[PDB]
Amino acid sequence: ELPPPHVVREAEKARADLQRQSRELAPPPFALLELIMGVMVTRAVHVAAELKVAEALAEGPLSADELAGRVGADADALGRVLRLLASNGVFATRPDGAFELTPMADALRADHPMSMRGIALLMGHPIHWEDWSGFPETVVTGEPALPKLRGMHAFEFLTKNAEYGQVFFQGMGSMSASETEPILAAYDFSQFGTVVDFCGGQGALLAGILGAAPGCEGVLFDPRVEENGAAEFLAAQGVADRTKRVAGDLFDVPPGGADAYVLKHIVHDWPEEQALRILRNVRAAIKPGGKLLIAEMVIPEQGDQPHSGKLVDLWLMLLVGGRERTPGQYADLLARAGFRLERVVETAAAISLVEAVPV
Amino acid sequence: ELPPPHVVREAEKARADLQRQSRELAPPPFALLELIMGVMVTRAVHVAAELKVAEALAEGPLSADELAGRVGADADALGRVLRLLASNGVFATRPDGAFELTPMADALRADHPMSMRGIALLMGHPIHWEDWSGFPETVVTGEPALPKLRGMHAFEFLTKNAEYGQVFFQGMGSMSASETEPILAAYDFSQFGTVVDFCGGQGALLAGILGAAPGCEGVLFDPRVEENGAAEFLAAQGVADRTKRVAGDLFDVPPGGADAYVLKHIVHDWPEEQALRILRNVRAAIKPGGKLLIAEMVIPEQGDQPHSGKLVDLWLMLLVGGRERTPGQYADLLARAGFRLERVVETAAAISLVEAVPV
């Protein structure tokens, strides 16, 4: 069972206070140096993921020599990487010299229900690693780095380079998979008779909604919906007889008259002009009584508390020219597309639901 | 002044306990994800350093809009970067949306006496960025990446590419500047009549030693001592009348019979065979009664407590095939070179002094 959202907000505030306390116990230049060197920790996590160290330790603790033999690495180098990771909570060292899992290292297993292996691999992938070298020019110019580095848009590059496209998609999945259940626990989808999951890919969220709302019928609206794997996935979830697959373009007007249009991680992909184009298309389809639900990490309007959206924001800026928004920015954007923001519904995770009605 | 080191050891333990409590409040996959994304915080600090935002805010708080023309960056992009940094204690957001300095952001100023600007710039430099792409194979093979990626030892690349050599030197200087005073407060250099700073660079440490020991004469032994600015620096420090500059190779026998040989961040750069060669050469120079002082981050023999040496170890592995060592590893290395470990002298910083006597 998932904790109520207010319990998670309290844990976030407590964590932020512990982190502020910690930083203040250090010389400021030393606390800054720790942040500067964080790229090295990323690299250490990445190699542990690439070598499937967590899978190798799932059957019990292994010495450096035994582990290195099973994963095909150097025992000395691997033990030194694991010593560093263990000092950050990822794996543990024993007095007898063997290494073993911790809860954080367990989430590097591919088969963990909330696996971070995908994003660990993506953050160290040579293509994405090079993307980050464009970050200073992105801040200078405001323009994403990917079109300058690759001669094309992010989406065109991912479809043309299918192998890295899967790396990228699995990296996005590590983050997205934690979002369905918090959304379902925070919002009553049984109020809806029909829902359109707008560019919902394989339909993970739509299947969640339909499983939670037995009287609801779903439209999975996605350009790839016939190649997606969606048909196999929706049937395995037992909702296929309540779903219509509609192949349509990202910039098409979706089927009209649905009780809810659900847009998860769509709006934040795009520069404002294209984001507005998409929302106006949804505005043309929606009827009075219908709701628009935008599922995104909403950045609080004020304050310096940590938020996942503040970090994901930079990633959007680098790659696609999108951004994360505050509630006030969502209100302004929605008002320019013929919508009124009604509420921002928080969840037990970082994502929220921006609820809007047509006006 | 600096505190006696037990206040520092207690703050280190408190910080470690606070970080562990913070990890325990988070879902393990999300705490892991924060570590995975460290590369993004490195890039955010790097662009703030490159743009000299800290200097721009010296006269008082400024909005991102006010900063755009001051530093030559996009107002929107810069504001989103600073918002992320401020959530990590680097700069802060005022209620009116303007950004202001914090003590950690103060340390990004180029002229800060403990400036971290040099290392922030090195960590994001494209050459260093590319070098880190060789880390997975360093762990697979145990071998440093530089010969494989660039066809030469890291230090030979530094010598042949003068511009990157200065970026690297400034980045090393950021971390080194924090080490001189802790070393002087921990160890009585007034007991020595003569001190050799072995491969001491420009002489920063040796100047500190001579200032702490007004009756001491120094030898600055370094291959580049006639080209690296040592004469100008020593004269500016007022110690040039008590310093002999000696040009020599890293693998030469240094001037003989000195009361103390000081090796700071020399031994950890080298595979064991080369490290022993250097230590045996010092052994051939030192005479009975002399002391060998090795200034390095010393990794504790057991436990998973955070220690700066555990992270720097991976940098050494990647770039030069060196390593950080525990006390017992230093004791074994010293014994094979004709020394005996006498004390490991802690300081108010991460670095320690390994004191050894010739046997």
Author numbering:
A (entry chain B), B (entry chain A): 3 to 361
Report text from the authors:
Here we describe an O-methyltransferase-like protein, AlpH, which is responsible for the hydrazine incorporation in kinamycin biosynthesis.
We determined the crystal structure of apo-AlpH to 1.87 Å resolution using the molecular replacement method, which exhibits a symmetric dimer conformation. The swapped dimer conformation is mediated by the N-terminal dimerization domain of each AlpH monomer, which interlocks with each other and forms an extensive dimer interface, covering a total surface area of 3947 Å2. However, PdxI possesses one more N-terminal α−helix comparing to AlpH for the formation of the swapped dimer. Notably, although the overall structure of the catalytic domain of AlpH shows high similarity to the SAM-dependent OMT LaPhzM and MmcR, there is no incorporation of SAM in the determined AlpH structure, in agreement with the previous finding that purified AlpH is free of SAM or SAH. Further structural comparison identified a unique solvent-exposed and negative charge enriched pocket between the dimerization domain and the catalytic domain in AlpH, which corresponds to the SAM/SAH binding pocket in MmcR28. Apparently, the bulky side chain of Cys introduces steric hindrance for SAM/SAH binding and the replacement of F241 by L252 also eliminates the putative π-π stacking interaction between SAM/SAH and the aromatic side chain of F241, leading to the reduced binding ability of AlpH for SAM/SAH. Given the uniqueness of the solvent-exposed pocket in AlpH, we propose that this pocket might be the substrate-binding pocket to generate 9. Intriguingly, the loss of SAM binding is critical for AlpH, providing an additional binding site for gluN2H3.
